[PDB]
Symmetry: C4
Subunit: 179 residues, 4 copies
């Protein structure tokens, strides 16, 4: 179920924060692992002051993730995927909970590089853990990081992803809410 | 009206908690009795520490029940029947109010058995009261319980259902909100 | 604007509470006067312990009125016009704010009589002020009240309605929110 | 991003409050600058007691702006663009946060004049800063103000707009929430 998945992801992230001195987590992609990482990020922000930013492919994906986060927090979802509504929801989520949800076209390497570069300008590269939310995101993220010369960051992204993938396969976040 | 129906169901459940040493209530099905049982379960969780889980047939039914529970609690409904939104809403409802809403295909005996077996793994069989929300759910639930050897549980499910059915016929939960 | 309309209706209702010893207000109908009366009823419940029940024609009308009340109170609207969602929202509104929104087919005299008779069973006839929300509701309500022998109640309904109609014509509740 | 845009607009408005003794801000138009000005107005109301009213072209635009404001404040959006729902949301926003969102057809000079004249009746002309949200709104607002003899107000509207336009071009309120 969802709690077991969030707990397992939280434990993995705690191990990485201690291992790498992480101050900021950037999640690239959508789906169940993106939600689980965002929810673990809510706990990590409250308990450790570590901020999390999720980069999703389009405004529709941002609305879907913000709506699931809203439900988890007991808060209203944004009324629509209007950019102004999404930006306002994002600013509120950041101020109150240390989480962001931003739009970046992951099919476009230049757009993903630009979104990462914005986050690196805000949060730096040394203390930032970048994680893909799935296989497709890993395949998009690795070459971009490698082009930027961030080989260690790419290596950690792949290794931590493998552990998260295995943990979520066992935890089954959504098992109770579909056939 | 709704308050009279919740009160009547609450009184019946209190009698069963004392009679059987009940720690967990599992409601199988949808409709007015499912809502009334869930609402009585909110009171029982607050007052007695007894948790309630409702098993509904599909994601659409989970959204409809979560939305009615939300309205009763003064909380936002989940934005959609997206599995991630439903799972997040369920985790929040459990943590704050001691209630869950899960999806289990009741037309499929193996799926209902699997969902009950998950709950029995979490909560045990001895202290768990299983109740159908209607005739169709009773007809689905009885053979599954009997196959599991849970004859007493099936007997209580049918007997308590009969009393709840009669009480709700008199109380008329929805009389003021349809023609 | 809306505040001026609520204030004017509130002042009129205060005068009637003192004049008739009113404990319960029943509003029959939909539209701007129904909303203004419901909002004044929120204030009267908080300040005076007087409860208000609005009888609207169908579930769609109940959702629209509950949604406007929700917006005025800073609360989530019910997710849909599902009867269970409307009944749950109504129970929450009553418990927290002393207001109800019920469905009664005003085109059907027997249905309106039945809905009034339910309220009279709950709240009595002597201390109950019944008000139409518009001309059509007044035309439906007067014969029903007269058949019940409630001639004084019908007379007050018409007289107080006339004063509310004039006050709302001057106050223009919705002037700032349509062309 | 949005926070940088709100901060930049806030700083400009603070300078104008000191420069002109402003008690009320009226924003004419829709779009990103309308949202940013409304959000800066939330801060100015809390910190300085300065109220802000946004005049938008139609009910659909009022819903979109109220929904984005709701998301920024962690509050439910109005269920629909129903005039009663919009008026109720507006009254709540004014009472709690010192902001209004009203409908005025800016394509119709008489309608814009009427909406401004209502605000001038409520708030006066001397202490009221009127700002367009974009080029089209400036082109609609200038002749109306000039016809009213409010030449200085029109001059300030154009000058402050130019500074806000430049600031928002640099701040990029919506950059993280569209492609």
């Amino acid at each position: 179920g969802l709690e077991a998945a969030v707990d397992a992801a939280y434990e993995i992230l705690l191990e990485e924060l201690e291992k790498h001195g992480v101050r900021t987590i950037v999640v690239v992609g959508t789906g169940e692992l993106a939600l689980v990482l965002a929810l673990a990020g809510v706990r990590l922000a409250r308990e450790r002051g570590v901020k999390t930013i999720v980069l999703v492919r389009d405004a529709a994906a941002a609305h879907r993730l913000l709506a699931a986060l809203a439900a988890a927090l007991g808060l209203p979802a944004p009324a629509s995927a209007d950019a102004a509504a999404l930006a306002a929801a994002d600013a509120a989520l950041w101020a109150e909970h240390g989480l962001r949800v931003r739009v970046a076209d992951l099919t476009d390497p230049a757009a993903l590089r630009a979104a990462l570069e914005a986050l690196f300008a805000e949060h730096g590269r040394d203390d930032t853990l970048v994680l893909p939310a799935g296989e497709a995101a890993l395949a998009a993220l690795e070459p971009v990081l490698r082009e930027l010369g961030l080989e260690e960051m790419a290596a950690v992204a792949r290794e931590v992803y493998a552990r998260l993938r295995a943990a979520l396969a066992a935890a089954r976040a959504l098992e109770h809410h579909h056939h």
